[PDB]
């Protein structure tokens, strides 16, 4: 930008309806701070966000280290406080060819004094004179009454800790909404009724893609069932709702009487009422716990060696 706003009034711009190519962001080799809390810069090309907010101001060298989530000082407490669960990161670089003129650049004003601690992501523009003692301060500027905004001394020959650094703060939000801003990754064709692992708007899972007749509200993007698993996909390229059919859905219990002891095993299906089975086999027996195949059934009652469930016991005999 041709100019940057002050510290007490930081300009924030919403970024949306575009793909965010971060490859020209973390590979600039001209910035000075890229400590990104939470998400990693290598994963920024894969994740998808609801919206991107980019704050901006100009700060000195000594206060660029105190814009972390948990910190204190005269900037994090009074001027710009990040949340403890902040997503994204700040970006700072040297600004000496610009924003540095002889005689001091007193255009910017930081909040030296304030009545209370600043809430996260809150911008405070107030010029009321702060008082200290019990004396009234109705617009006066006497003793124990100072202007809350203090100017900055930015000279080309000033110290490195007091040099003006252009700070831009990228913040990412993850809300229950379609992601209008995503990484520069492309998109392949859509397949149906096949057990294919998928990558839908940053959500990765394996399943079978099937058409869903459910009506989906525009506010939501993902549908979760009682089991808290993915069931609905918006698919923003085509904007149609697909039901995620799991590749494996039933309960299978394998009655294995060891490996070296015997090579014959029995398969018990919990959700099958004896088909969607591995094999038909023989000696199909239906119990209260489900359908059991590959094991014989007898009318005798022996001791329980390998329990099956609901009083059903199976053993390896001659």
């Amino acid at each position: 930008a041709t100019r940057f706003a002050s510290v007490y009034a930081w300009n924030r711009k919403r970024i949306s309806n575009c793909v965010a190519d971060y490859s020209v962001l973390y590979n600039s080799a001209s910035f000075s701070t890229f400590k990104c809390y939470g998400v990693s810069p290598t994963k920024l090309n894969d994740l998808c966000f609801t919206n991107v907010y980019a704050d901006s101001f100009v700060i000195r060298g000594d206060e660029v280290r105190q814009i972390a989530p948990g910190q204190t000082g005269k900037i994090a407490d009074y001027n710009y406080k990040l949340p403890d669960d902040f997503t994204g990161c700040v970006i700072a670089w040297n600004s000496n060819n610009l924003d540095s003129k002889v005689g001091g650049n007193y255009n910017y004003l930081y909040r030296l004094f304030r009545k209370s601690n600043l809430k996260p992501f809150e911008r405070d523009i107030s010029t009321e004179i702060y008082q200290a003692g019990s004396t009234p301060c109705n617009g006066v500027e006497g003793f124990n009454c100072y202007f809350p905004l203090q100017s900055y001394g930015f000279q080309p020959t000033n110290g490195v800790g007091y040099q003006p650094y252009r700070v831009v703060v990228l913040s990412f939000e993850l809300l229950h909404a379609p992601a209008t801003v995503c990484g520069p990754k492309k998109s392949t064709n859509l397949v149906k009724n096949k057990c294919v692992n998928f990558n839908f708007n940053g959500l990765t899972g394996t399943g079978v893609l099937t058409e869903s007749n459910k009506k989906f509200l525009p506010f939501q993007q993902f549908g979760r069932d009682i089991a808290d698993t993915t069931d609905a996909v918006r698919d923003p390229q085509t904007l149609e709702i697909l039901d995620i059919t799991p590749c494996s859905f039933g309960g299978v219990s394998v009655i294995t009487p060891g490996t070296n002891t015997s090579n014959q095993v029995a398969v018990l299906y919990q959700d099958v009422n004896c088909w969607r089975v591995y094999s038909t086999g023989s000696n199909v027996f239906q119990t209260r716990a489900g359908c059991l195949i590959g094991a014989e059934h007898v009318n005798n009652s022996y001791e329980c060696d390998i329990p099956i469930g609901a009083g059903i016991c199976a053993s390896y005999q001659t």
């Epitope: 706003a5 009034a9 949306s16 004003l109 911008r123 107030s126 100017s151």
Partner: antibody
Framework: VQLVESGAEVKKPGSSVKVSCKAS????????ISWVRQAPGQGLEWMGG????????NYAQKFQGRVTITADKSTSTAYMELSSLRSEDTAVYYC?????????????????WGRGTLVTVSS | SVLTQPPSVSGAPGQRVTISCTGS?????????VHWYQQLPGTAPKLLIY???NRPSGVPDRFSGSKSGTSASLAITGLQAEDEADYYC???????????FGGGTKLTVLG
């Protein structure tokens, strides 16, 4: 209070003007002063903002080399000066007092406005 | 700059009128509050609504505004014979680094 201004002025197309906004009934004690023009038949246009305590000023990106604004903390008077007048500079110029507040958006608002000075150019 | 509003609106004393004020991502969609300024034909504009909900003293309760998404809405319950004025929505822009006013709505009630 009341932020009265000067009377209507007529200037040449290519001269410089000098208007004032005097705070009557009080002073703009630690409150920033802004200026807004209004062309006849057009919306309000922002000139610049001055906080009189620090004596600093800023201007919009549309114009920076033709407008210079100053203020006096003692006599409580803020001024304009518009050099290089053109034929499209005819408007009514108001002095406005910014009233800031704390919040998430926190957009500046001008609650106290001046009486308006008519400035026109005629060869 | 980009604070476009309908050039004119119409209404009756017995109904409701809604004034729309849309912008861009950097002025309204970013979260900045909007400010409404009623300019009577012949005097200086005054602060009608600031903070998108707060009413300064003197302004009647009939002047209620709201902000949602990337747009601003101003609603008037009762329209008397003195409500004929130009209404400008004002907010803060990030690219211009300055306050921006609305294009102007010619609210005319006459017959």
């Amino acid at each position: 209070v009341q932020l009265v201004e000067s009377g209507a002025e007529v200037k040449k197309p290519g001269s410089s003007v000098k208007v004032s906004c005097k705070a009557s009934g009080g002073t703009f004690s630690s409150y920033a002063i802004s200026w807004v023009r209004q062309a006849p038949g057009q919306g309000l246009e922002w000139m610049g903002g001055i906080i009189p305590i620090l004596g600093i000023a800023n201007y919009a990106q549309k114009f920076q080399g033709r407008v210079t604004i100053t203020a006096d903390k003692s006599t409580s008077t803020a001024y304009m000066e518009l050099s290089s007048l053109r034929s499209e500079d005819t408007a009514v110029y108001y002095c406005a007092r910014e009233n800031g507040y704390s919040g998430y958006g926190a957009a500046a608002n001008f609650d106290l406005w001046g009486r308006g000075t008519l400035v026109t150019v005629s060869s | 700059s980009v604070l476009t509003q309908p050039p004119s609106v119409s209404g009756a004393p017995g109904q409701r009128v809604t004034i729309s004020c849309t912008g861009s991502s950097s002025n309204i969609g970013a979260g900045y509050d909007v400010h409404w300024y009623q300019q009577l034909p012949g005097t200086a504009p005054k602060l009608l609504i600031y903070g998108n909900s707060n009413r300064p003293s003197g302004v009647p309760d009939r002047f209620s505004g709201s902000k949602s998404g990337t747009s601003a809405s101003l609603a008037i319950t009762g329209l008397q014979a003195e409500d004929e004025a130009d209404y400008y929505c004002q907010s803060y822009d990030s690219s211009l680094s300055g306050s921006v006013f609305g294009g102007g709505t010619k609210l005319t009630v006459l017959g």
